[PDB]
Design a protein around this nucleic acid. Structure first.
Ligand SMILES: [Mg+2]
Ligand SMILES: [Mg+2]
Ligand SMILES: [Mg+2]
Ligand SMILES: [Mg+2]
Ligand SMILES: [Mg+2]
Ligand SMILES: [Mg+2]
Ligand SMILES: [Mg+2]
Ligand SMILES: [Mg+2]
Ligand SMILES: [Mg+2]
Ligand SMILES: [Mg+2]
Ligand SMILES: [Mg+2]
Ligand SMILES: [Mg+2]
Ligand SMILES: [Zn+2]
Lengths: 217, 308, 115, 108, 59, 153
RNA sequence: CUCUUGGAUCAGGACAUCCCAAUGGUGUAGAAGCUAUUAAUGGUUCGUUUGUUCAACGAUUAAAGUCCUACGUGAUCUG
């Protein structure tokens, strides 16, 4: 059972009614266009109509590196390198000028954000434009690709080694001395994981949404 | 002691009566709300036709939140949601009493509890036979557009395509400094500055030997009435009484706002097309669609937009 | 977001940009009411002890949804008359350039890839 | 910056006798039915609460003697008995605390 | 009939009344005719105010 | 501006706040009735409730055991939580603690005080406030009104 | 024969107007310009010293105005 991220409400003081109203419109678009299941790390091809030109479409293939947004404003960003020039485009799922979304390769990665690929070697971001879809098996669990990438020289876009990011998909041993690793651990904040008032349990909310979505079907 | 003591409704209520009184009050609200559902069959005041220069009453709504929206050209617009909730007409002043050239009508909304209110307000509402409302405001209405007190109002009073005006109290930020409050530049961080980073410079010239009234200084910011002009209406939901308005509205979520049609010069006499006195569903000449849209709006469940 | 003294990359086949030099080019002026330069903006460039006009075609700062964000700040050299200095471009160029107010047809002709 | 003039007793009387600076009177004082001592409506009675805490100390003092050391918390429920009382069947296998005095009237 | 007072000479166009709000730029000067248009009683009232003794009993 | 901040600032910092609350929670489990200052007890009340939820999960749950180990400094009390307190509150869905304000401390700082406890303990009962009986004059009139409305439809 | 000013911050005001606005004359064909009348509305940029006795240079702008307010302003800061 895969419940898409946007359906889960964020916590706050907003009324539940505003969420019910938004959900109705989201479901209606899904009947017209089907939104496939995917996770950060999977490769996608998205087709959209080009506004500047007249009745001419566009296609972009890349790996999904982030999923954000709630409700009708949900987004996802996918990355690729063309002629040795890196490009990223941020897409909204419910934008009406998206013709089709195709999951070329469905897979999961160790982390739920891959923004550190900007600092990794170019090979880990390049994907063949014309690669054909790979088979999928219904009676299975989604695969977890456990690749650990290699990084370029130390000056980076962010300090990925620091404990807040919680990166588990970088080969730090190759790039950093053990002395530097202890230097980073001075920012740990160990107590955060053990305080019970910072945790948001959404199991019941997830369950209730499931039947209503299925019931509407 | 032969002296004053203070009380509250729950002080003397026993265990059984505590729940009973809660239930009794809730039923009283429902009976009084249903009775007012039929204005047209309750001796309505005469309904005059529209004439140039006419002004119409407005509503009180609650701010739900925001969401995106798209037009048939693919342009994306952020929109805010306003819900009408138990809006009634309360009191009428004739032109001479109000002291304005025009007459006035008072509107209330958002039913509230009766327990922690002054007696004066409760007596006022008992006369009108309605449960109390959180907020009252005043609207300037012409004689032809006057409406009898006690008549419910609904979101369908507005229709898509018309511009509107909204006013509400802004978010309160407390006592604030000159940099945040008035956007003052401040001073450099380094090069020898001594304990002067975010402070104002000179108040004024030395010659006057005083400070001009109205000088900009630190003080409490926010929590003031502000108005936004010329916001289009994109869509209306008849079932839940929801209005969608272009752009931003002042205040936090769950805050009451005042809605009235635009007073800008361009939209001077657009009221003729809209229901002139108000919208009455009691008439039941036709049942409205659940959702009302504007032509440029791209509705969901329509086919994907192709920029042919 | 290109500004005065920003270092930029010349994505062009012109000899002036192609030839390696000990200093990378730097922006000297932005032809805008604001100082910030975005895609479709001309700037004044300092190259090899010389000044030349140039046009921004990409940058690393986020924009609105559904538009491409590049990994480097890319520029094209433009002659005083407005004719491109170079004869070819290989890196992908955004399609937003077509409709933005300005003269972009000449550069679009020389560019093969549009993203 | 230093004062340029002495402030007079008349001006000073107006600053410190302003109604803003005076002690406000309280309207939430009531009498306790059980003991007859005073209390605030939203607060527990001090005299009545004082009784309970004294008994609580006695019980805990006895609990300390039985255990005999730290880190001896039982894994079974506890119960208190007074002279003249014997464990019931439901009391089987539960720590029993013994008090010399008779059961207090208020304690149930 | 304070609206029907009369001025000798060209006083309607030459007599100026001045006021200040108290804020920078709050100085306003208006002629007699303009003030008479806005308020039909101001001219007569201002004349009487000036001729009374300048003390608290004036008000 | 502090809109939407659900935590108090206590101690010497964020980590110090957790440690102070942990010490109070450990004392509550052992003794089952505690006195602290009103603000501190109110902040710790939330954690006390959530601890009884992990206890319900059971001894064999790996996550529950890890959480209990961190929040109880004295280790003779982990058996107590999983085998005494958790069984006691099986029926209820919440409201495991009772908290009341106590007269101000008489120690020259005059702090606002409170008493917090777990329901169902063996200690002498607290002197709680009782609502008025139904035999009083006002209650009877309301009772009369209820009977008429119930009987007459 | 000799011997207080800059900058930052925030600006109050005058009109002897630099730009924006309404007009007259022309050795005003159009487009550019030169001159005069009326008006204080808001605005009036960013960097740099090899030579220059209170100067100059680069890139721009619709314009980069002239002045008064104990250097307007050091119990707000600084060379
Ligand atoms: Mg955010
Ligand atoms: Mg950076
Ligand atoms: Mg917009
Ligand atoms: Mg606030
Ligand atoms: Mg600064
Ligand atoms: Mg400092
Ligand atoms: Mg003076
Ligand atoms: Mg006095
Ligand atoms: Mg708060
Ligand atoms: Mg000024
Ligand atoms: Mg002049
Ligand atoms: Mg001074
Ligand atoms: Zn008592």
């Amino acid at each position: 059972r895969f419940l898409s991220p946007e359906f889960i409400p964020p916590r706050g003081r907003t009324n539940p009614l505003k969420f019910k109203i938004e959900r109705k419109d989201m479901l209606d678009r899904r009947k017209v266009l089907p939104i496939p299941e995917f996770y950060v790390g999977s490769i996608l091809r998205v087709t959209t109509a080009d506004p500047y030109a007249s009745g001419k479409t566009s296609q972009f293939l890349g790996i999904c590196i982030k999923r954000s947004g709630n409700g009708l404003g949900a987004t996802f960003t996918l990355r690729n390198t063309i002629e040795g020039q890196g490009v990223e485009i941020c897409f909204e799922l419910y934008n009406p000028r998206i013709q089709e979304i195709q999951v070329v390769k469905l897979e999961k990665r160790l982390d739920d954000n891959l923004l550190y690929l900007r600092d990794a070697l170019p090979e880990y971001s390049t994907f063949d434009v014309n690669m054909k879809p790979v088979p999928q098996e219904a009676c299975q669990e989604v695969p977890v690709n456990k690749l650990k990438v290699k990084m370029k020289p130390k000056p980076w876009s962010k300090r990925w080694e620091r404990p807040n990011f919680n990166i588990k998909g970088i080969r730090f041993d190759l790039a950093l001395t053990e002395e530097q690793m202890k230097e980073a651990q001075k920012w740990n904040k160990p107590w955060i994981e053990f305080d019970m008032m910072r945790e948001y349990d959404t199991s019941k909310i997830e369950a209730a949404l499931w039947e209503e979505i299925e019931a509407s079907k | 002691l032969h002296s004053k003591s203070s009380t509250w409704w729950d002080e003397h209520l026993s265990e059984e009566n505590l729940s009973f009184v809660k239930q009794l009050v809730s039923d009283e609200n429902k009976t009084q709300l249903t009775s007012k559902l039929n204005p047209l069959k309750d001796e309505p005041w005469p309904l005059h036709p529209w004439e140039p220069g006419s002004f119409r009453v407005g509503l009180i709504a609650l701010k739900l939140g925001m969401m995106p929206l798209w037009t048939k050209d693919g342009q994306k617009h952020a929109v805010t949601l306003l819900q009408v909730q138990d809006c009634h007409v309360l009191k009428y002043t004739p032109k001479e009493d109000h002291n304005g050239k025009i007459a006035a009508l008072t509107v209330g909304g958002k039913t509230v509890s009766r327990f922690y209110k002054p007696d004066s307000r409760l007596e006022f509402y008992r006369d009108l036979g309605l449960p109390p409302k959180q907020i009252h405001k005043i609207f300037h209405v012409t004689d032809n557009a006057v409406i009898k007190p006690g008549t419910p109002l609904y979101a369908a009073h507005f229709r898509p395509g018309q511009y509107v005006d909204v006013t509400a109290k802004t978010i309160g930020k407390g006592f604030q400094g000159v940099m945040k409050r008035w956007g003052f530049k401040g001073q450099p961080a380094s090069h020898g500055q001594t304990k002067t980073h975010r402070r104002p410079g000179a108040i004024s010239t030395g010659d006057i030997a005083r400070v001009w009234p109205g000088t900009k200084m630190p003080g409490r910011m926010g929590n003031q009435n502000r108005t936004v002009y010329g916001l289009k209406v994109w869509r209306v939901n008849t079932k839940h009484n929801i209005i969608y308005v272009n752009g931003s509205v002042p205040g936090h979520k769950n805050c009451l706002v005042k809605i009235k049609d635009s007073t800008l010069p361009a939209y001077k006499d657009s009221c003729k097309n809209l229901p002139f006195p108000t919208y009455f569903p009691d008439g039941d000449e036709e049942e409205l669609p659940e959702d009302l849209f504007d032509e440029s709006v791209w509705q969901p469940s329509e086919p994907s937009i192709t920029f042919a | 977001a290109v500004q005065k003294m920003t270092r930029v990359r010349v994505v062009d086949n012109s000899a002036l940009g192609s030839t390696p030099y000990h200093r990378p080019p730097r922006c000297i002026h932005v032809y805008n009411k604001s100082g910030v330069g975005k895609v479709g903006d001309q700037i004044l460039l300092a190259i090899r002890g010389q000044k030349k006009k140039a046009l921004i075609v990409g940058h690393r700062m986020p924009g609105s949804r559904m538009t491409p964000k590049f990994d480097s700040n890319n520029v094209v050299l433009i002659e005083d008359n407005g004719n491109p200095v170079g004869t070819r471009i290989k890196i992908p160029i955004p399609t937003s350039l077509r409709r933005r107010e300005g003269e972009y047809s000449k550069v679009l002709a020389i560019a093969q890839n549009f993203v | 910056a230093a004062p340029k003039n002495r402030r007079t007793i008349e001006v000073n009387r107006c600053r410190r006798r302003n109604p803003q600076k005076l002690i406000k009177i309280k309207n939430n004082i009531d009498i306790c039915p059980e003991c007859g001592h005073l209390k605030q409506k939203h607060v527990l009675c001090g005299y009545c609460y004082e009784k309970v805490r004294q008994e609580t100390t006695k019980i805990r003092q006895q609990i300390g003697a039985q255990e005999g050391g730290p880190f001896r918390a039982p894994s079974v429920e506890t119960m208190v008995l007074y002279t003249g009382e014997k464990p019931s069947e439901k009391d089987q296998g539960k720590r029993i605390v013994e008090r010399n005095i008779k059961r207090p009237s208020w304690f149930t | 009939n304070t609206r029907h007072i009369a001025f000798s000479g060209n006083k309607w166009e030459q007599k100026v009344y001045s006021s200040h709000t108290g804020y920078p730029g709050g100085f306003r000067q208006v002629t007699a005719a303009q003030l008479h248009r806005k308020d039909p009683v101001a001219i007569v009232k201002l004349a009487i105010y000036g001729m009374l003794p300048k003390n608290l009993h004036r008000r | 501006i502090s809109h939407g901040r659900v935590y108090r600032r206590l101690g010497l910092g964020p980590e110090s706040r957790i440690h102070l609350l942990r010490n109070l929670l450990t004392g509550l489990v052992r003794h089952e009735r505690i006195e602290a200052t009103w603000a501190r007890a109110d902040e710790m009340r939330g954690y006390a409730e959530k601890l009884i939820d992990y206890g319900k999960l059971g001894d064999t749950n790996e996550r529950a055991m890890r959480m209990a180990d961190f929040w109880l400094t004295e280790k003779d009390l982990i058996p107590k939580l999983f085998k005494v307190l958790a069984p006691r509150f099986q029926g209820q869905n919440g409201n495991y603690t009772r908290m009341l304000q106590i007269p101000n401390r008489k120690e020259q700082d005059r702090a606002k005080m409170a008493v917090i406890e777990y329901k169902g303990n063996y200690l002498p009962p607290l002197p709680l406030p009782h609502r008025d009986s139904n035999l009083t004059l006002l209650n009877q009139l309301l009772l009369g009104l209820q009977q008429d409305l119930h009987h007459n439809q």
